[PDB]
Every structure is written in C-alpha cells, then in structure tokens.
Design a protein around this ligand. Structure first.
Ligand SMILES: [K+]
Ligand SMILES: [Mg+2]
Ligand SMILES: [Mg+2]
Ligand SMILES: [Mg+2]
Ligand SMILES: [Mg+2]
Ligand SMILES: [Mg+2]
Lengths: 144, 150, 129, 81
RNA sequence: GUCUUGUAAUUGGAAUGAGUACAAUGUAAAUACCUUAACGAGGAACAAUUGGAGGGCAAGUCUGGUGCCAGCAGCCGCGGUAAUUCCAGCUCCAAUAGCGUAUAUUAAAGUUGUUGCAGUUAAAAAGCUCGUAGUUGAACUUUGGGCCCGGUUGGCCGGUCGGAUUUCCAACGGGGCCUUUCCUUCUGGCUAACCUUGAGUCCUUGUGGCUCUUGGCGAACCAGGACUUUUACUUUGAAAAAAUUAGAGUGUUCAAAGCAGGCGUAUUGCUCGAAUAUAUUAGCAUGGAAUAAUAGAAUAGGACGUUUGGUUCUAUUUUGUUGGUUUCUAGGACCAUCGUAAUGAUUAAUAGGGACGGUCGGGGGCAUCAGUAUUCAAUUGUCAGAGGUGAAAUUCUUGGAUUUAUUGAAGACUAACUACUGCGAAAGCAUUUGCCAAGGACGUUUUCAUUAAUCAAGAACGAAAGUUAGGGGAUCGAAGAUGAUCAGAUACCGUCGUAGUCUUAACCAUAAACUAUGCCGACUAGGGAUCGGGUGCUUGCACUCGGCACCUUACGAGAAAUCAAAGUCUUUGGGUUCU
C-alpha cells in the first residue's frame, strides 16, 4: 500500500497520525502553543503605543550602505523594549524623545524587512498625528 | 513465506483431483480403520500412522478411502492425545533447547531460537483455547514443560 | 498475505490489457470476481471467460478484446448513500457518458446506472472503463 | 506471445511445469506393486517411500528412502499399480 | 470636405439635484426621506481621491535635484555624477466615494495529502528480530429454468407542430406462482371474496367477462398465548424551533431588502399569497439480504413426534354460593422408552503450523587438534657495522649487533585455497576432529484446518571503541616519549611506548549498524552463468523448486543519476508499521 492505513475501521489512526504531523506546520504550532500572547512584543495585537527612549542610527546590511533611522521604544502595555523604523525622508526629525508613538508591524509576520538588521516594527503616528500627514505637511506636530 | 524466517519455500504435497477414489485399491473402509486403530494403540501419532498407510499399505489418503480424517478415527475410538500433536512437538522442541541453554549460557543463538519456538507455542495455544480443544486456562509454563510432554 | 482476491484479479487483467495480451489466468476465483466479470461482459469490456474447477478456490481464464482501459477495485469498500454515487462517478470515471462504478447492494452486484434505476445503494466495489 | 490457449496447454509443456504450477495441481508420484525374490506375496509401495518398507511375511528390505524417489533393493520386480 | 471621428485656455441655447427654503406630507412630537412653490453649474467654479509607473504587475532608458548619502525596496533589487526604482515636476496606469497600511484568518497549499504528498541520492525506512493492543485477513452454502399478473416511459397513427387512448412493437423496472423450495407458528373475529350456483346467456374481437344461494378456500385483516442467533451496511418514511442558507412568487421607482400584494362598478368589495429543498453522526419505524462479521448437531446433553409411560405443577364454565376438595380435563414445564430421518464433521489455499526423508552450510555453543610467522630466551659459528628513510637522525653494537643454524616458550592470528561463492534476524561467521542442540531449501497421494500479515506498549540480540574486577600481556599501538621536516609542526615521515588490542564475569546500546531502498502478497520481459535439493537420463546436459547475484532492453517509472524494481500512481485505493 501507500504507507498509511486504508481500512474502513482505521479512522482513529488516521485522525491521530494527522494531529501529530500538524505540529510540523509553522502556523499551527504558533497558534496552539500561544506564542503570539506568551512571547511576541505586541502580545498578538496589530499595533502598540510606546514611549521613545532613544534615536538609533542602524547601519544597513550588505551590499547596501546607509544609516537607517530608528527609535528604541518602551511599550506602555508590557514594558517591552523594541526598535522601530521611522520611515520616509527626514521623519526622525519629527519624533523626539519621550514622545508617544504608535507602532505597527513591518509586513513580514514578525521577520525583519529589507536590509535593516533587527527591526520588526515601524512608527505610524507621533504624539497622536500621522507620520504620513506630517511629511505631506497636512497636520502640525503638537506642542507635546 | 515462513513465520519466523526470511525463507519463502513452496515445498508441499499436491493432493490429486480425485476425491472418490481409487480404482486399483481393494482393501475396504472397515479394514483400514482397524489398521489405523492398531497403530494408535501401539503408540503412534496421526501423522506417523498416515505415513505407514501410504508406504507399506496402499492408502493414498485415509479421508478418501475411509471417509473421515485420521484424527476423527482416533477421536471416536478414544485414542485422543491430551494436547494436540503439533503443539506437543513444539513443546518437545522447547524443552530440548531450554535444557541445552542451562549448560550453554553463552549460546546466544540458542537464546534467540528459544524465543521463536516459545512464540509459536503461545500462538498455537491461543488458537486451541479459542476453538476449545485446550481448556480456557491452559498455559505453557517453562517450569512445568518437561513434566507435560515426557 | 493475500487480502483482496478481487484486487489481484483486476490487477492481472489490467497488466494483460496493457501488454496487448488477449487472455489472462486469474487465481483464486470467487463469487465476487465472477459477479464482477459478468458486469464487464454485459457492457462488452471482455469476451468469454472460463472457470476451471481445481477442487480448491478455482482459476479463471478471461478473454480480452482490447476495449478495456482500466478496471480497478476501490478498497476499502466504502458505504455509499444513494445521494453520493454522483461524487464517486465524478471522481473515478473519464466522462459522464460512459464507464461504470460497480456496487455491492442487497439487490446484487451491479453498475451504478442499474442502481439508479432500481433505486438502491450499498458498498462501492470497483470500477470499469 | 500475445494470443495463446491457456485452457489447452501442450502435454510436453505441462510435464515440464512444477507439480503445483500446472493448470490443475496433482501428484507426479505413483504407487508400485513390488515383488521380492523369496516370497511371492505382493506389496503396494509408494514411489517416494520415506519408510524402510518391509514385507509382512518375508521381513526383508524392499526400498531404502532418499531425498525424493525411493531406491528399491537390487533383486526386485516392480510395475506402476 | 466628401461619411464622420478626435483635438482647441472658440462660442451656443438647454438639463439638473447637492444645497437653501413656502407649504403640505411624515411623526407621540418632531427630524430625515418621498412630493413640491420660490431660489439654486460656466469650468477660476458645486474644482475626487487614494495608491502606483524596472520585474512579479496595468502604466515613462521624459525633465530637474541628490551622488552607496538621503532615501526606496512585501520579495528580486535600486542609489558610489546620463538613477526606467530615492526627493520633486510633467505625463500615464489602476481601483474610485473610496483607496492604502498593520495583524489575524481562508483560498492559492497535492507546502498536512480520506479524497491526495514524500522517505536510494533533495528532509525522512527503526541496527535487527520477537510481540500485546490496533488495523487487516483465501475459497465454499438457492443457482438456473419455466410461468403469470398488474406497472412506467418511448411508442405506432400525437393526427390541430400541444395534449389524448386501444391492442401491439419494446425497453426498463415491480409483485406472486411452480420447479426436492419458511412464505414465524397456531387460536377465534369474518369469511371478505370468488371454481360455493335458487332464476345461465346480463354481454366490443370468447384471454378488451354477471344479476347471488348453502359448508366454503380466511394471507384480505386484527389481538392472542407460543418462541423468536446477533450485528454492521443501504432504501423509504418520520424527526432534526425560528432566523440564517439554497429556493418559488411578488416591479420595494432599480437594488440590498420586505412579505407583501393584485383586480372591481374605487359610491359601502372581490381575490391570489406568505411555497418548496437541504441539514449525517445518534435514536425511532420500514423494505432489501449482496458485501463484512456472528451463532448452531462431534464424548450428541442434537432435531421432529399423533407416540407409549412416569413426574411436575397450574385452574376455567360447572358440581347453588364463598369454602373444603379428589378426578375427567385443558394448557405448561421435566425425566424415561419406542418411532421417523440420506440422521449430524465444506474445501484442503503455488496461506500457515507440525511430522517424516535424504541432505546442505566459513550458522551457534562447549571441548579438541594443528599451522607457519612474530618477539624473546638458551646453544651456535662468524666479524663491522646493523636499523630506518625521499634524504637523514633517534636506536642496537668487537662483553660480539645484524646475518646463520639448533632446541624452546608465550600469547595472538587462521595466509595461499578465497570467488560478483556459502551460512546467519542483523551484528557477524574461514585450521582439524568430537559432543550439544538449532535451521533453511528440496522431496512428500503424511497431519491440523485459518491457527495468519503488519504491529503502539513491552522484550531478545547488537561491530569497534569505552567502563568495573580477576587472568593474560607476543604483535601493533591512542596518550606520551623521541629524531627529522617546517616560519611553526607537541602533524603527516622515522624509533620507542602506556591504556588498549586477547580472555572470564558484569556493563554499555551505538556506527556511512548502507542495498544510504520497511515488511507481507499478486502481476508485468528476454538471456545466460552459479549455489543447494529433486527429477529425467545415455551421466553432462536438460527440466524443476528455492537462493546469492549478473547481462540486454525498457514495456513502464523517474528531476535526473538511474531502476525487473525505484514498474503495475491525476486512468490517482491489495494489507500494514515507522519517519
Ligand atoms: K507592464
Ligand atoms: Mg508463497
Ligand atoms: Mg511476523
Ligand atoms: Mg512535500
Ligand atoms: Mg518500540
Ligand atoms: Mg543512528
């Protein structure tokens, strides 16, 4: 035969065998262990607010050459320290330290994007306004 | 092929097409039963009987000429062994090898081969207990094996 | 060990039709093999066949006529509601126009058209086209 | 060979085939009516003997057993019955 | 300017609700729709966006800027001075009152595989065998034939292009009979009926047939004791709230919806609706009896019985009636005895086990034989070197090395023979001869009769190294010593040498433990070699079964290398374990 039981009364083995083999899948294992909640900075939420601690100039990976502009953030919910990218041209100017940022994912299910080492997040808003809006120059960065 | 080996040998008897038979054999059905029963009292097994009736006499298969199989002939006359013939001969074999291992502890192959023989015993005994020719609490014990067979 | 005598019969038939032979020895025989072969004959996928009494299980000698693409068992013999013959025929057969899924029903062994007409169902057995 | 008669094999080929591989299996052993020199009492003896077959009255050897077909004693007369 | 199609920051009269707002309508009161006076588009205004334009992917090697920076880039990649990719302008693409981003999820995913994956080499067959649950498991038991009666579609003349029926042409389905043919059995309801005939010809082709009397013939039709192998599966029914889903009807102005609605003489009213289907696994009722399991008569305690006795209780209308109470009965159990009967055991699987026969083998264990060599030591002669290397040195040596002869001991090993040979579950196994059990294959007109296949759990065995404790300790030799080499060389090379190498009793549990190929079964193709058994002979050849392999082709298979299995897999299902 094909190395799996074919018998009419073989449903138990088939069901149990398949359960055991589903642990080899990536998404299944993460979903059942509860990795998103247990580890994972955001705790299985699409976004998270945090407080900017620092400004980091992260040297890009090879063969590109650049200093990608990033912020070390401490999230309000957990206290988990995290690095986030600050996208678009000269947007690090808007952030400043001790400014409340909303972070999002980068697009790759918790993998680092592009050539930026060790950065899995991005800034979306600073002090309750959009980085898009500040850089298109629609809204004004508040006093605090 | 074989239960406890890689051997795939096909050697066996080929029984002939003829059931009602044969035309060259003259001795009657009642005559041969006597010859069977005579050999049973003298202390032979159903297999040993049927060899002598093939060779010295002309009996092709007793089931043809007599009607019934030799075990039924003995079962009717009351020369039934306490435990079946094939089981007996396996136990006999076990007792031999067990007795051999007592003197030869380093005979690793005998230890192996003893596992196989005793496995066949346990499988047969399981069979007999189902079809109720051994009693339902019958058990092959290595201790009380030499007592039973001989 | 030998488990499906029907599987072995149909396998032998398939192998011979592939090699362009016009005859096959099958062994064992069985009621179910014979019943199956008669369904194949009735639709003209084989010719004559001849059971050979050997005072044992028997042998068959089928005659082949080139028309058979594929016979085959299904194993295990799934239970089939009347509703769900349409799924088995969709899966197994080359078209909606021809070829037969073959069932054991309490009515008898038979093609799936007969089972539609007679309004019966049971266990799937094999297929022919 | 694509087209062949399986139901009617030639008797030559069916003799070559092994005792189980023939269209119907059956034994290629036979019985013998052996006759010893001293006594004329006739004994049925099977070709593949296994037993060392002694006559009941005479008490002498008729055939010694071997691998297959039993080798009979030197002074005997036999015929397939 | 022919028939018309684009483009002009060229000019025309029309059209309009977005908005504002009479007033109605709407509503508990409003608000908003719906309706509507009056008022309300000329493009600068009543002004559409969000994302892109290298590829994937639809749209530019167009202009300016920056020069591996800033930045982009889901991914591949762009950017270091002509950037098709960054920041911009222009132009263009896509979707559009929406479009993007993040996270999760479904499809794509035959990348979870029941359908339906993969496991020689890409990840992956357990070192090997035993083995309980589990899964799976050969064939066989009323088959065929002859009848008969209603059905359902197409008929054949659908004749008016749409529907009708007679018998017949059929096909396909269904029921009941007969054929050595359970079609539960009997006990009153009822005999309805129709071979019961008190008025026979009421009446289309004698197969398209009655006015009812007299036991009837109860399978047409209800409740009774009487006992009824048991499942699985499948048909039909019933059930499985509504909403939701599919779905019929219906112009909510269309639609999502909703469950309304629609026709009158609109002046005293008529009318269609709010269907239907699916939803198993479980339970219930019902028809079928293939397939798959299950039980039955073998020490007969077996079956049928108007028998022929014993024995054991049960109680009805009576015998007035409660009650005492023996029987005849009338139905039950129960033990005998005679009777009837074909009296009762399926094959014997190119399934398995067991016996028997002659064998085969470097299979195993315990004893026992040799063999030369190696190192060493006694007795020997001899005289400078001998060892060792690519070349040297370390070392042994005129107290005689090495070389040579003689007789010894010790431990190990088992040459040559030795192979595309054998045996073993694998690891492994090779001097002789005994003893002990074991085993395959072959032969078999012997025996049992499904006892089997594969197996979570659980077990036996498992190269070398390694461990503990006794023996042993020749040789080789991790470590280590030590001479060369080299930039280094506590590496390769060279000389020694500890544990180790051997053995006993215990452990260990692993290896490229490899055919990197699970096992069992079947089938598919030529060939010659060879090993074991058997048979025939014209005695070395053939046939045969069983083995180790090998050669050709490729039918097929494969990503290919390649493969007679790695084939019989999208024409996808023989059984089963592991990954
Ligand atoms: K394009
Ligand atoms: Mg076999
Ligand atoms: Mg096994
Ligand atoms: Mg895969
Ligand atoms: Mg295990
Ligand atoms: Mg390993």
């Amino acid at each position: 035969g094909k190395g799996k039981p074919r018998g009419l009364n073989s449903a138990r083995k088939l069901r149990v065998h398949r359960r055991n083999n589903r642990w080899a899948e990536n998404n299944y294992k993460k979903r059942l262990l509860g990795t998103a909640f247990k580890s994972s900075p955001f705790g299985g939420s699409s976004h998270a607010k945090g407080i900017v601690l620092e400004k980091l100039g992260i040297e890009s990976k090879q063969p590109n050459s650049a200093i990608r502009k990033c912020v070390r953030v401490q999230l309000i919910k957990n206290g988990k320290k995290v690095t986030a990218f600050v996208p678009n041209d000269g947007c690090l100017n808007f952030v400043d330290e001790n400014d409340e940022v909303l972070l999002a994912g980068f697009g790759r299910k918790g993998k680092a994007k592009g050539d930026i080492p060790g950065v899995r997040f991005k800034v979306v808003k600073v002090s309750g306004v959009s980085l898009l809006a500040l850089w298109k120059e629609k809204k004004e960065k508040p006093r605090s | 092929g074989r239960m406890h080996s890689a051997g795939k040998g096909i050697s066996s008897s080929a029984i002939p097409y003829s059931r009602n038979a044969p035309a060259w054999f003259k001795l009657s059905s009642e005559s041969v039963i006597e010859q069977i029963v005579k050999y049973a009292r003298k202390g032979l097994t159903p297999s040993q009987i049927g060899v002598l009736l093939r060779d010295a006499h002309g009996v092709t298969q007793a089931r043809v000429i007599t009607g019934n199989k030799i075990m039924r002939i003995l079962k009717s006359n009351g020369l039934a062994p306490e435990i079946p013939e094939d089981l007996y001969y396996l136990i006999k074999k076990a007792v031999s090898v067990r007795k051999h291992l007592e003197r030869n502890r380093k005979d690793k192959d005998a230890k192996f081969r003893l596992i196989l023989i005793e496995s066949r015993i346990h499988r047969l005994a399981r069979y007999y207990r189902t079809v109720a020719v051994l009693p339902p609490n019958w058990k092959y014990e290595s201790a009380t094996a030499s007592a039973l067979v001989n | 060990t030998r488990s499906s005598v029907l599987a072995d019969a149909l396998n032998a038939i398939n192998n011979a039709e592939k090699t362009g032979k016009r005859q096959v020895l099958i062994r064992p025989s069985s009621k179910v093999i014979i019943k199956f072969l008669q369904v194949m004959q009735k639709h003209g996928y084989i010719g004559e066949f001849e059971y050979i009494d050997d005072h044992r299980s028997g042998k068959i000698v089928v005659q082949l006529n080139g028309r058979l693409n594929k016979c085959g068992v299904i194993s295990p013999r799934f239970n089939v509601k009347i509703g769900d013959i349409e799924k088995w025929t969709a899966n197994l057969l080359p078209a909606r126009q021809f070829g037969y899924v073959i069932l054991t029903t309490s009515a008898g062994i038979m093609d799936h058209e007969e089972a539609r007409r007679k309004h019966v169902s049971g266990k799937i057995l094999g297929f022919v086209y | 060979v694509l087209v062949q008669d399986l139901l009617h094999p030639t008797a030559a080929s069916e003799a070559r085939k092994h005792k189980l591989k023939t269209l119907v299996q059956g034994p290629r052993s036979y019985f013998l009516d052996v006759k010893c020199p001293g006594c004329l009492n006739i004994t049925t003896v099977f070709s593949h003997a296994q037993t060392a077959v002694t006559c009941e009255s005479c008490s002498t050897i008729l055939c010694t057993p071997t691998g297959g077909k039993a080798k009979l004693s030197e002074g005997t007369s036999f015929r397939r019955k």
